[PDB]
Model the fold of this input.
Amino acid sequence: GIVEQCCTSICSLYQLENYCN
Amino acid sequence: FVNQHLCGSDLVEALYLVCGERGGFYTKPT
Done:
């Protein structure tokens, strides 16, 4: 889910902003 | 700030920093 998005690649703090959807 | 990694706590932690002030919630996993 979400761990496979940032834990696999270095996401930008802006990508996490979407994590709060 | 980018160029970092996470998982388990680091995730809910980093996720809690980007949505700390603004937002006003989390996600409610499981």
Remarks:
- Helices of chain B lie at 8-18.
